């Protein structure tokens, strides 16, 4: 007797990986890194028009 | 952790081997906290002692006198269990199974023996070594001594019998405490040895304060004060006993000692002191009857 | 800027046998046996995954426990940095028990009925309330127990902040509770010390220690944008501070409810003891200062150690807080371990 | 580890800081918690209460306030002890030296004792400065409220005062495994039995409740089994109250939904079942042997971990 048992191949996806700053959305927001806000406790905008 | 790893002895069957990867998150009593241990030495055929296997006393007199460690990693050839004694209290978080009831987010959960709930239930047997493993349950210190207590009654109801103490409501659902069937016969043969001792601790301290209460403060402030607070309790209880029963200094003394000690090693025995509290985090805050469950050394 | 005596800061400004220890052990092979003969969004991705770099190059004073809740009963964002917050736990038993437990001449309907009306007053779902705040007892049972004004000044933080008909309703079950025999405690235990709330709407996530010191927690001046920290009794009212007589010790801290059985119809007293004695010596200097035994059973008290004050002296009594516009005599506690403790009252 | 330090005071003879280095392990009790501390707090001469020396049933009511404490180190000026009773939070496992005739076992929770056996070693006088130290002996937690059950009834027996003849039964002698020990019979002061009395009688009423009296009507049938198993024989003592106390419903039920007799055993379980404590100290230690050894011999060092 020889028998064998197979593994007939390993497949696995690439998670892949989507920015947001190459995308439609984008433009609907004015996007800034204010590392400091977390040490914030108020924030303002003025509009006078 | 300090971890200390179990020894599975020789080959063991397959089916055994996937027994023992089900165990992962069960407590286990090892009787010394060497790093290296038999498998044997854990296994409930270790608790024999008087030549039969323990009731459900003389259990919870093992399980005050060995250590729990719940187990982490279970590992052919090796099982890797923590002691639950061991480093210091509210740290080595090490995950538990919930058995029963939920297990709320606290509450210190108590091991108990497993003959309190479905019998059998949890021995899980291993047949290629021979040997076999009863997990005690975890529960709540609340509960667990709600229980304990509860089916101590029942027991004294039984011994002589003719508002069900079996129904209980936890939590969500109404909890059921009777089996039925042979059951509560087989709960019942268990306990048995503890229902007297609890039987007896009872009438042997009643009939020796109500013997020693009038047998003292007739020979100070120990008679005025007593008498005063006790005033339609104890001396209504001593005519009512004498009542229906019947009534010694150098006895009384001499019972008097022997009765205090029994008494406290029932209170030992008794409680159930928790083991571990649960303080869950990022966590379900309620842990489902057979989930892990996270758990810290000290109430 | 360097000293003259150098041996003290060089073990105070800032191991070798772990270096030894790997040294025979690690460093000798085959042993043993032998044989003879991308400005800033960059720069904070890169110092997380670094952060996950130390953390994970090493490895307990501390222990935080996290519950979600409504804001119903409690309130985190009434309440501050440092806080008692109790567990409530099962309000499916609206009296079940009160079938069983509660002695005859008992109107075991109360609880049901109290406690349903409380939940009118204020269904199951998405998530549950428990999380009872230590100022939320104070005002229920403000009126109740002896103190009043500086008691309910505290009553007017809550209804200001966290409504006088969940306090009322509250104060109800409270006392139900207490008529019936089961009482405040076996329910409402310790939960923590609030570090960090996290409200929703009516949602309420809330952090807080399961043990170990207080003042090192989020820190800084205040926990987030907010102000400072402490364990401050809350109450000029609570904050009984045993020790009238005393000698340097590690004052301890401990939750006694005390009650009323006829004597005053079911009273709910609720406070903190800070005196050095260790609860087998608690019991006993209990059992005097209280009148409240009122038969009118036998269970006046019962009590838990939340923990130590590993120092006697910051004991800081402040009538100066505000948790909105209310101002309260607010005691201070200035630091504090939490040891949970259990539950002992048996007479 | 929040260890206390204790200072040794001036110098005492160097005969005398060789009698300090071997308390290394031996128990000693602090009035209070504290880092900076007089090597006279923790002197018998501090145990004195006014005017007067506490008997040994005196002393378990002085260890019952205040805190053991563990030597762990002493050193030429101070002696390191870490407060069991708080700071037994360390990872291993103090160290405790058994004195003591008995012997540990593992997993015993071990309460602290008074001197107490006929042949004692626990002076330790210390001529330069005037202060002596008694050292509590360690002992199992069965043996201890065994030893405690004998000095209140001794005090007490003894106070009735016991009308009947001379001759009383011994109580001054135990057995633990072989070896009969022998109690220190000597003094027993008013205020010292009064108080262990007080608690003893104030608890054992609280124990009895309306549902009790429904387990008195099965003394009768205890006794049925007293003569037909052999356990359950041997469960009731030979000198057996209740055997004596049988030489009943009482209808009276509330409505019918109490459970009176889980309620009374409840009732019991706290008073009555809590008595080795509340008339002596509590187990804060249980031995526990990393290295596998199973006891610890007499005047061995016995690790110890936290609460049984």
Redesign the interface.
């Known amino acids: 007797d020889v028998e064998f048992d197979a593994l007939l191949g390993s497949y696995c996806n690439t998670l892949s990986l989507v920015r947001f700053l190459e995308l439609g959305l984008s433009v609907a927001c004015v996007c800034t890194k204010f590392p400091e806000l977390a040490y914030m406790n108020e924030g303002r905008v003025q509009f006078e028009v | 952790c300090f971890e200390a790893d179990i020894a599975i002895p020789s080959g063991i069957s397959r089916p055994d081997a996937a027994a023992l990867q089900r165990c992962e998150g069960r407590v286990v009593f090892l009787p010394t906290i060497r790093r290296q241990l038999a498998l044997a030495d854990v296994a409930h055929e270790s608790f024999v002692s008087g030549g039969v296997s323990p009731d459900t006393l003389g259990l919870l007199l093992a399980y005050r006198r060995r250590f729990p460690a719940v187990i982490t990693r279970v590992l052919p050839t090796r099982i890797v269990a923590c002691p639950v004694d061991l480093g210091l209290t509210h740290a080595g978080t090490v995950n538990l199974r919930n058995t029963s009831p939920v297990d709320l987010c606290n509450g210190d959960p108590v091991s108990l023996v497993p003959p309190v709930f479905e019998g059998q239930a949890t021995d899980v047997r291993l047949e290629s070594l021979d040997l076999t493993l009863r997990f005690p349950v975890p529960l709540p210190t609340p509960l667990a001594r709600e229980i304990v207590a509860r089916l101590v009654a029942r027991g004294i109801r039984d011994l002589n019998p003719d508002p069900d103490l079996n129904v209980l409501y936890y939590n969500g659902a109404r909890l059921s405490l009777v089996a039925d069937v042979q059951q509560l016969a087989s709960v019942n043969t268990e306990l048995r040895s503890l229902v007297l001792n609890m039987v007896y601790s009872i009438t042997e301290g009643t009939t020796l304060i109500l013997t020693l209460i009038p047998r003292l403060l007739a020979l100070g402030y120990v008679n005025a004060l007593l008498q005063m607070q006790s005033v339609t309790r104890e001396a209504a209880q001593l005519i009512h006993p004498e009542a229906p029963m019947l009534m010694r200094r150098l006895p009384l003394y001499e019972a008097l000692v022997a009765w205090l000690a029994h008494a406290g090693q029932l209170g030992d025995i008794l409680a159930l002191a928790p083991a571990v509290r649960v303080c869950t985090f990022d966590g379900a805050a309620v842990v489902q009857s057979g989930d892990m469950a996270p758990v810290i050394r000290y109430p | 800027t360097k000293p003259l005596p150098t041996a003290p800061m060089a073990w105070a400004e800032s191991s070798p046998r772990e270096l030894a220890g790997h040294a025979p052990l690690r460093r000798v092979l085959r042993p043993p046996i032998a044989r003879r003969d991308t ?3 960059r ?2 991705t890169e110092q997380a995954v670094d952060k996950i770099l130390r953390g994970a190059r090493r490895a ?1 004073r501390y ?6 809740t409504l804001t119903d009963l409690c309130q985190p964002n009434a309440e501050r940095a440092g806080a008692l917050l109790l ?1 409530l ?2 309000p ?2 609206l009296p ?2 009160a ?6 001449g008992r109107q075991t309907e109360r609880l049901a009925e109290a406690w349903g009306q409380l939940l009118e007053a204020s269904e199951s779902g998405c998530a549950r309330a ?1 999380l009872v705040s230590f100022n939320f007892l104070v005002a229920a049972c403000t009126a109740a127990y002896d103190a009043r004004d500086a008691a309910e000044a505290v009553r007017a933080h809550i209804t200001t902040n966290y409504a006088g008909a969940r306090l009322d309703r509250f104060s109800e079950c409270l006392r139900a509770m207490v008529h019936t025999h089961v009482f405040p405690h ?1 329910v409402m ?1 310790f ?1 923590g010390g609030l570090v960090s709330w996290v409200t929703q709407d009516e949602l309420a996530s809330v ?1 807080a220690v ?3 010191p207080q003042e090192a927690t989020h820190t800084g001046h205040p926990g987030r ?1 907010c102000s400072a920290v402490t364990i401050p009794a809350c109450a000029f009212v609570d904050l009984d501070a045993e020790l009238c007589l005393g ?4 004052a301890f801290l401990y939750l006694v409810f005390t009650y009323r059985q006829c004597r005053d119809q079911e009273l709910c007293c609720v406070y903190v003891v800070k005196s ?1 004695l ?1 609860p ?2 608690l019991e006993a200097a209990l059992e005097r200062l209280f009148g409240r035994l009122r038969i009118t059973t ?1 269970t006046y008290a019962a009590f838990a150690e939340l923990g ?1 004050m ?1 120092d006697d002296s910051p004991r800081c009594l402040h009538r100066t807080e505000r948790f909105g516009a209310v101002g309260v005599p607010v005691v201070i506690l200035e630091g504090v371990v939490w040891r ?3 539950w002992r009252a ?2």
């Not at chain 3, 222990?63 to 979600?68: D, E, G, K, P």
């Open positions: 400005r800033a969004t720069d904070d307990p222990h935080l426990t996290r519950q979600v567990a736990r099962h499916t038993d079940h028990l079938r069983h437990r509660a002695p005859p428990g076996e235990r939960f952090t399961c043990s170990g944008p000698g340097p010790g590690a050095q260790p087998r010596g036998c130590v590993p949970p403790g259990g048996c007479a």
